[PDB]
């Protein structure tokens, strides 16, 4: 599913992501924009053989099982395919664990490089929230 910007903001809010670990909703929408372009089916293979999945590009090295990342963990206790669903629940629940792991949203490289320190409220501006 390719979400619209305000559509994703609303889904993230409903699932409790807004202000989670102190990160306002625009931070989450901006991260999704640059990780996945709002496409739940996004995937990206990394040089190490791990893969990033879904709207927040969550990595199989640590967070989900894909059966093809040796020595990896599955700390969200989910198949990585669950992160590709039209329903963002699994992605949101796993993102809450990631952002709680000590480095905040710096876990998402596109957030650090493209959202951190910017006017992230622009991503939710205009939305009926």
Are 33 and 18 a contacting pair, CB within 8 Å? no
Of 7, 48, 52, 119, which residue is the catalytic one?
Answer: 52
Are 41 and 47 a contacting pair, CB within 8 Å? no
Phi and psi at residue 121, in whole multiples of 5°?
-65, -20
Is there a catalytic annotation at residue 35? yes
CA distances from 88 to 30, 48, 77 (A): 16, 26, 16
Residues of the domain holding 63: 1-129
**Resolution, angstroms, 1 dp:** 1.1
Looking at the DSSP assignment, which residues form a beta bridge with residue 65? 79
Are 19 and 25 a contacting pair, CB within 8 Å? yes
Of 7, 35, 48, 119, which residue is the catalytic one?
Answer: 35
Are 40 and 53 a contacting pair, CB within 8 Å? no
Looking at the DSSP assignment, which residues form a beta bridge with residue 44? 52
Phi and psi at residue 67, in whole multiples of 5°?
75, 0
Classified as helix, coil or strand, 9 is helix
What is the token pair recorded at 64? 């989900």
Is there a catalytic annotation at residue 7? no
Classified as helix, coil or strand, 51 is strand
Experimental method: X-ray
- Domain at 17, CATH number: 1.10.530.10
Q: How many angstroms separate the CA atoms of 120 and 5, rounded?
A: 12
Domain tally, the chain:
1
The answer to whether the annotation marks 48 as part of a ligand binding site is no
């Amino acid at each position: 599913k390719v979400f619209g910007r305000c559509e994703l903001a609303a889904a993230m809010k409903r699932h409790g992501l807004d202000n989670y670990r102190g990160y306002s909703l625009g931070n989450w929408v901006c991260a999704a924009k640059f990780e996945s372009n709002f496409n739940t089916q996004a995937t990206n293979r990394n040089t190490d053989g791990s893969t990033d999945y879904g709207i927040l590009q969550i990595n199989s090295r640590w967070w989900c099982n894909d059966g093809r990342t040796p020595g990896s963990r599955n700390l969200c206790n989910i198949p990585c395919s669950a992160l590709l669903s039209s329903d963002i629940t699994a992605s949101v629940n796993c993102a809450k664990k990631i952002v709680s792991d000590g480095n905040g949203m710096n876990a998402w490289v596109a957030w650090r490089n493209r959202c951190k320190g910017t006017d992230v409220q622009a991503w939710i501006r205009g939305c009926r929230l």
